[PDB]
Write a protein that binds this ligand. Structure first.
Ligand SMILES: CC(=O)N[C@@H]1[C@@H](O)[C@H](O[C@@H]2O[C@H](CO)[C@@H](O[C@@H]3O[C@H](CO)[C@@H](O)[C@H](O)[C@H]3NC(C)=O)[C@H](O)[C@H]2NC(C)=O)[C@@H](CO)O[C@H]1O
Ligand SMILES: NCCCCCCOP(=O)(O)OP(=O)(O)OC[C@H]1O[C@@H](n2ccc(=O)[nH]c2=O)[C@H](O)[C@@H]1O
Ligand SMILES: [Mn+2]
Length: 272
C-alpha cells in the first residue's frame, strides 16, 4: 500500500452540526461499516502516517458521547487516520479528575497499538470543519480554537483546553499531564505551562477552520471549581518534574470493546 496523500482529498470542509435529535449507536455503527470493534479504523487503500489514539475523559456523559461518536467517526475516516477511540470512565462518585484520566488513556492505549499521536478531547466538543486535523504536528496542537461558547474565538491567547493533540514524544517530554488537579479548572493552563517550559509553542488552524460547537450543558456534580488551581498553575515548572506520568498509578476495573469505542473504567482514587 502506498502512503496516503499528505492532505486527504476526501474532505468537504464546513459541515452542519446539530444536537436536537436522538442518536442510535446501532444505526451509527451501520452508517460506519468500516469502523472495527473497539472503535478502530485505518484506510484500506493507503497507509496513514497518523496513528492516533483519541482520548476522552468521562463520567456520566453518555448522551454527549453519542453525539460525539455520530459526528467524529465520519470525519476521522475522511481524514484518513489510523485511529482508535478511548473513553476513560472514572469509576466511583468522588471528585472528578480530568487530567489524570487523560494520563490513564495515554498509558492504556499504548498497550493496544503503537500509537504515536494522542488527541485529548472533551466529550461535548464537535468540530464544524473537517479541515481541522485531528492528528499531530511538529509542535503541540490546539484544535478547538473557535468555540461557539467563547464567541468563535479563543477566550485568551494561551488557552489550550477542549481539544488538543500531542505526539507521543511531546507528551513524554512534559512528563504527561498533572495528576493533582481535582475538580474543575486550571489543568489545561498547567499543561500549556509545561509545553512552554519545555521549549514548545502552540500550533493552531485558523479561526474559521477551527470553529467548534460545544453542547450546552449544566454543571456536573462532583467537579466543583478547584480553589487551589490558581496556586497550582503558578508552580508548574517545579511540579511537572515529579508530578505526571512518573508519579501515576491507577487500577483498571473494566475494559469494554464496543463497536464504536473502547471504554476503560478506572479507579483513579482521591486526593493524597
Ligand atoms: C490580568 C488578569 O489577572 N486578568 C483577569 C482575567 O484573567 C480574568 O479572566 C479569567 O481568567 C481565568 C484564568 O485564566 C479563566 O479560566 C480559564 O477558563 C478556561 C475556559 O473555561 C478553562 O479551560 C481554564 O481551566 C480556566 N483556568 C483557571 C486557572 O481557572 C477564565 O475563563 C477567564 N474569564 C473570562 C471571562 O475571560 C477576568 C475575569 O475573571 O478578570 C481579569 O482581571
Ligand atoms: N452554565 C452552565 C455552566 C456549566 C459549567 C460547567 C463547566 O463546563 P465546561 O468548562 O464545559 O467543563 P465540563 O464539560 O463540565 O468538563 C470538561 C470535560 O470533562 C468530562 N466530564 C466532566 C465532568 C463530569 O462529571 N463528567 C465528564 O465526563 C467531559 O469530557 C467534559 O466535556
Ligand atoms: Mn463542557
Amino acid at each position: 500500500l502506498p502512503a496516503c496523500p499528505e492532505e486527504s482529498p476526501l474532505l468537504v470542509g464546513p459541515m452542519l452540526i446539530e444536537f436536537n435529535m436522538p442518536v442510535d449507536l446501532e444505526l451509527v455503527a451501520k452508517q460506519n461499516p468500516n469502523v472495527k470493534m473497539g472503535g478502530r479504523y485505518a484506510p484500506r487503500d493507503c497507509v496513514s502516517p497518523h496513528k492516533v489514539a483519541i482520548i476522552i475523559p468521562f463520567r456520566n456523559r453518555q448522551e454527549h458521547l453519542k453525539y460525539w461518536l455520530y459526528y467524529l467517526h465520519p470525519v476521522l475516516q475522511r481524514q484518513q487516520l489510523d485511529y482508535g477511540i478511548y473513553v476513560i470512565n472514572q469509576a466511583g462518585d468522588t471528585i472528578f479528575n480530568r487530567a489524570k484520566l487523560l494520563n490513564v488513556g495515554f498509558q492504556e492505549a499504548l498497550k493496544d497499538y503503537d500509537y504515536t499521536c494522542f488527541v485529548f478531547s472533551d466529550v461535548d466538543l464537535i468540530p464544524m470543519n473537517d479541515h481541522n486535523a485531528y492528528r499531530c504536528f511538529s509542535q503541540p496542537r490546539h484544535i478547538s480554537v473557535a468555540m461557539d461558547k467563547f464567541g468563535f474565538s479563543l477566550p485568551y491567547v494561551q488557552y489550550f483546553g477542549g481539544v488538543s493533540a500531542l505526539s507521543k514524544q511531546q507528551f513524554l517530554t512534559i512528563n504527561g499531564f498533572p495528576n493533582n488537579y481535582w475538580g474543575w479548572g486550571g489543568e489545561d493552563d498547567d499543561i500549556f505551562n509545561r509545553l512552554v517550559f519545555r521549549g514548545m509553542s502552540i500550533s493552531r488552524p485558523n479561526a474559521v477552520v477551527g470553529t467548534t460547537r460545544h453542547i450546552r450543558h449544566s454543571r456536573d456534580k462532583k467537579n466543583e471549581p478547584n480553589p487551589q488551581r490558581f496556586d497550582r498553575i503558578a508552580h508548574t515548572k517545579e511540579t511537572m518534574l515529579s508530578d505526571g506520568l512518573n508519579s501515576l498509578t491507577y487500577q483498571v476495573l473494566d475494559v469494554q470493546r464496543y463497536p464504536l469505542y473502547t471504554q476503560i473504567t478506572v479507579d483513579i482514587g482521591t486526593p493524597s
